Amino acid sequence: GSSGSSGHFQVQLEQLRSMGFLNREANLQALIATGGDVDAAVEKLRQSSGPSSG
Numbered sequence: 001g002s003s004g005s006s007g008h009f010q011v012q013l014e015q016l017r018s019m020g021f022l023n024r025e026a027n028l029q030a031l032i033a034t035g036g037d038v039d040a041a042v043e044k045l046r047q048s049s050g051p052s053s054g
Contacts, residue, residue, distance in 0.1 A: 012038045021045060023054065 007013075009031040015038055016027050026048065027041060034040040 009036055012036055012041070016041070016045070 009028055012031055013021075013024055013027055017024075019042070021027050021042075023045075026045065030041040030044045030048070031038070033044065
């Protein structure tokens with residue numbers, strides 16, 4: 001980090017954000033479940049996200 005608060009799942013969120021995961025709220029929870037792991041989260045986020053919903 002270079003001058004700026006230290007978030008929990010920032011970097012991890014960053015990527016997600018790019019992927020189109022504009023659901024930090026969900027991403028977080030997921031990230032929490034996994035423990036920060038993004039790849040894993042994704043695998044979850046994807047699953048969680050029903051067939052066209054959100």
